[PDB]
Chains A and B, each alone.
Chain A
Amino acid sequence: KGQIISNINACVAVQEALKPTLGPLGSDILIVTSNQKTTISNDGATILKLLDVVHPAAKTLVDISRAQDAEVGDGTTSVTILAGELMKEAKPFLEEGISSHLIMKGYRKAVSLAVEKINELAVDITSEKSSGRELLERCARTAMSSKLIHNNADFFVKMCVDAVLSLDRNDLDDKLIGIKKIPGGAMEESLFINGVAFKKTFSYAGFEQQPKKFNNPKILSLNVELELKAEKDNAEVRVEHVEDYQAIVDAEWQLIFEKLRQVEETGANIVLSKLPIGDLATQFFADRNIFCAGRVSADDMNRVIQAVGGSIQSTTSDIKPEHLGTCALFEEMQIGSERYNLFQGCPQAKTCTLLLRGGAEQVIAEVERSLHDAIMIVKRALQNKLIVAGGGATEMEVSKCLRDYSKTIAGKQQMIINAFAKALEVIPRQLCENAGFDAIEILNKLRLAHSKGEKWYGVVFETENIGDNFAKFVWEPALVKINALNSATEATNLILSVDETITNKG
Chain B
Amino acid sequence: SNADGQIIKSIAAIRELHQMCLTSMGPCGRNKIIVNHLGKIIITNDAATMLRELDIVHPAVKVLVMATEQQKIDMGDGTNLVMILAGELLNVSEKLISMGLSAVEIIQGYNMARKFTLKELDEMVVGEITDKNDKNELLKMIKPVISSKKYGSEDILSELVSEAVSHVLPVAQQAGEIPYFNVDSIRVVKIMGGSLSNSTVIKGMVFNREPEGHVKSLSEDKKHKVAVFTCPLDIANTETKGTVLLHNAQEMLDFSKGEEKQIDAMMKEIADMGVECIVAGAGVGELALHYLNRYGILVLKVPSKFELRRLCRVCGATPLPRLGAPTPEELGLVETVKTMEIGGDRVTVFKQEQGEISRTSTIILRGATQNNLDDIERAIDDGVAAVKGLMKPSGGKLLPGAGATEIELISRITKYGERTPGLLQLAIKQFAVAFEVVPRTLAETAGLDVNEVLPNLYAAHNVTEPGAVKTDHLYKGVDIDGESDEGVKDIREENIYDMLATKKFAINVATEAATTVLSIDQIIMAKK
Classify A-B as touching or not with yes or no (CB < 8 A).
yes
Least CB distance from B343 to A in Å reads: 12
**Which partner residue on chain A sits nearest B35 by CB separation?**
A503
Instruction: Indicate whether B55 reaches chain A with its CB closer than 8 angstroms.
Output: yes
Kindly state the separation between the CA atoms of A502 and B482 in the bound complex, as whole angstroms: 31
Interface residues of A in 30-70 (CB under 8 A from B): 56, 59, 63-64, 67, 70
A contact residues, total (Cβ < 8 Å): 26
Please determine whether B32 and A502 come into contact, CB atoms closer than 8 angstroms.
yes
Instruction: Indicate whether B446 reaches chain A with its CB closer than 8 angstroms.
Output: yes
Known A-B contacts A71-B193, A99-B447, A102-B447; A499 and B30 likewise in contact (beta carbons under 8 Å):
yes
Instruction: Indicate whether A133 reaches chain B with its CB closer than 8 angstroms.
Output: no
Kindly state the separation between the CA atoms of A506 and B42 in the bound complex, as whole angstroms: 14
State which of B28, B53, B193 has its C-beta within 8 Å of the C-beta of A504. B53
Chain-B contact segment, one of A167-175, A286-294, A330-338, A490-498 = A490-498
Interface residues of B in 437-463 (CB under 8 A from A): 444-447
Instruction: Indicate whether A101 reaches chain B with its CB closer than 8 angstroms.
Output: yes
Instruction: Indicate whether A412 reaches chain B with its CB closer than 8 angstroms.
Output: yes
The 10 closest A-B pairs by CB, nearest first: A506-B37, A102-B447, A503-B35, A99-B447, A67-B368, A56-B33, A502-B34, A101-B447, A500-B32, A499-B30
Instruction: Indicate whether A201 reaches chain B with its CB closer than 8 angstroms.
Output: no
8 new A-B contacts at CB < 8 Å, known A504-B37, A506-B38:
A101-B447, A105-B447, A497-B31, A498-B30, A500-B20, A501-B33, A502-B35, A506-B36
Known A-B contacts A101-B446, A101-B447, A498-B43; A504 and B36 likewise in contact (beta carbons under 8 Å):
yes
**Which partner residue on chain B sits nearest A67 by CB separation?**
B368
Please determine whether A502 and B193 come into contact, CB atoms closer than 8 angstroms.
no
For A468-503 the 0/1 string (1 means CB < 8 A from B) is 000000000000000000000010001001111111
**Which partner residue on chain B sits nearest A502 by CB separation?**
B34
Which residues of B lie under 8 Å from residue A494 when comparing CB positions? Answer: 371
Least CB distance from B115 to A in Å reads: 38
Which residues of A lie under 8 Å from residue B37 when comparing CB positions? Answer: 504-506
Please determine whether B55 and A504 come into contact, CB atoms closer than 8 angstroms.
yes
Known A-B contacts A70-B193, A102-B447, A499-B23; A63 and B370 likewise in contact (beta carbons under 8 Å):
yes
Please determine whether A497 and B30 come into contact, CB atoms closer than 8 angstroms.
yes
Q: Which residues of A contact B (CB under 8 A)?
A: 56, 59, 63-64, 67, 70-71, 98-99, 101-102, 105, 108, 412, 490, 494, 497-506
Known A-B contacts A497-B30, A505-B37; A102 and B482 likewise in contact (beta carbons under 8 Å):
yes
Kindly state the separation between the CA atoms of A174 and B30 in the bound complex, as whole angstroms: 41
**Which partner residue on chain B sits nearest A411 by CB separation?**
B482
Give 12 CB contacts A-B under 8 Å: A67-B368, A70-B192, A71-B193, A99-B447, A498-B43, A499-B23, A499-B32, A500-B32, A502-B35, A504-B53, A506-B38, A506-B39
**Which partner residue on chain B sits nearest A506 by CB separation?**
B37
Kindly state the separation between the CA atoms of A505 and B34 in the bound complex, as whole angstroms: 11
Least CB distance from A48 to B in Å reads: 15
Which residues of A lie under 8 Å from residue B35 when comparing CB positions? Answer: 56, 502-504
Please determine whether A101 and B20 come into contact, CB atoms closer than 8 angstroms.
no
Please determine whether A504 and B482 come into contact, CB atoms closer than 8 angstroms.
no
Interface residues of B in 16-56 (CB under 8 A from A): 20, 23, 28, 30-39, 41, 43, 53-55
**Which partner residue on chain A sits nearest B38 by CB separation?**
A506
State which of A56, A67, A101, A505 has its C-beta within 8 Å of the C-beta of B41. A56
Instruction: Indicate whether B369 reaches chain A with its CB closer than 8 angstroms.
Output: yes
Kindly state the separation between the CA atoms of A242 and B266 in the bound complex, as whole angstroms: 57
Kindly state the separation between the CA atoms of A344 and B218 in the bound complex, as whole angstroms: 42
Known A-B contacts A500-B20, A504-B37; A490 and B369 likewise in contact (beta carbons under 8 Å):
yes
Kindly state the separation between the CA atoms of A497 and B193 in the bound complex, as whole angstroms: 24
Least CB distance from A1 to B in Å reads: 12
Kindly state the separation between the CA atoms of A52 and B12 in the bound complex, as whole angstroms: 38
Least CB distance from A43 to B in Å reads: 19
Least CB distance from B45 to A in Å reads: 11
Kindly state the separation between the CA atoms of A146 and B37 in the bound complex, as whole angstroms: 50
